[PDB]
Design a protein around this ligand. Structure first.
Ligand SMILES: Cc1c(NC(=O)c2ccc(N3CCCCC3)cc2)cccc1-c1cn(C)c(=O)c(Nc2ccc(C(=O)N3CCN(C)CC3)cc2)n1
Length: 263
């Protein structure tokens, strides 16, 4: 529990699923981002109880939760500050003119965070470039892991909703609501595709409906130009029709390191 007296709001960073997000200072020294939770957007009591578990989740490649302000409405979620914002927008800026080695490093950053979460049996459920952030040193970190469970918007949580992550979901999620470590694995493969295609929308010429049909037929995303045979094999391995044939994040990390050494 952070005392709100220790927080200074400085600028607005934008709006997400839970409302306004601000940049500020913690104890007059530390850069922070602060979610101001819009009343009605979150299952607040449930979040508050889980907050402890999530505060114990500490990894260099996870956006660090610093604390909460819950003795007030609206409640605050105080986190690490990531100066360069959203990985998706970051990818779409042509000026960065990324080398492929830099692209693979983004993949490795995320894979490292996901391996940690996997070892803690903790699912993200909404892994995508939009939900990764970039700090001042170009380091990519995974944001809002596990927070999907507290969203009240039916357009987001329902498979047929307009905001559901259809293009990042394996067939068994869309057809059966079968969520597992292997559904996070699938989404990671799609994230790799996002990175290597420099922020293109997956299945960019299809609707959400057509995408579901496509992956049910055993068909998959094409190799991004910038991805080698080896890089494509890795992301593709994440998209095996049988969930238990998909790799673990530990195996993926090993494969990424291999490619780094080889290419
Ligand atoms: C994270 C974030 C959001 N989005 C959400 O809050 C949200 C997203 C999904 C969601 N769902 C439900 C739960 C499961 C996942 C899906 C719920 C909430 C909105 C606005 C800012 C930040 C933000 C945060 N943090 C922790 C930051 O550090 C940060 N930093 C920024 C830094 C710079 C910019 C910026 O303005 N630019 C423009 C100039 N460029 C040079 C740099 C980037 C923006 C954000 N922004």
């Amino acid at each position: 529990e952070i005392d709100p007296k220790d927080l200074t709001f400085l600028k607005e960073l934008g709006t997400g699923q839970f409302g306004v997000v601000k940049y500020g200072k913690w104890r007059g020294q530390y850069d922070v981002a602060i979610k101001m939770i819009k009343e009605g957007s979150m299952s607040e009591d449930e979040f508050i109880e889980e907050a402890k578990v999530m505060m114990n989740l500490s990894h260099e490649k996870l956006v660090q939760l610093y604390g909460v302000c819950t003795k007030q409405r609206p409640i605050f979620i105080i986190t690490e500050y990531m100066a360069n914002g959203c990985l998706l927008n970051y990818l779409r800026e042509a000026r960065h003119a990324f080398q492929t080695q830099q692209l693979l490093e983004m993949c490795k950053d995320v894979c490292e965070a996901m391996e940690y979460l996997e070892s803690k049996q903790f699912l993200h459920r909404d892994l995508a470039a939009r939900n990764c952030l970039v700090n001042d040193q170009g380091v990519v970190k995974v944001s809002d892991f596990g927070l999907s469970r507290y969203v009240l918007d039916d357009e987001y949580t329902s498979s047929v909703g307009s905001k559901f992550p259809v293009r990042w979901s394996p067939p068994e999620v869309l057809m059966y609501s079968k969520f597992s470590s292997k559904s996070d694995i699938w989404a990671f493969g799609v994230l790799m595709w996002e990175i290597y295609s420099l922020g293109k929308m997956p299945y960019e010429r299809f609707t959400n409906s057509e995408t579901a049909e496509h992956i049910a037929q055993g068909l998959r995303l094409y190799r991004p130009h910038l991805a080698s045979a080896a890089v494509y094999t890795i992301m593709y391995s994440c998209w095996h029709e049988k969930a238990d044939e998909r790799p673990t994040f530990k195996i993926l990390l090993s494969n990424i390191l291999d490619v780094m050494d080889e290419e």
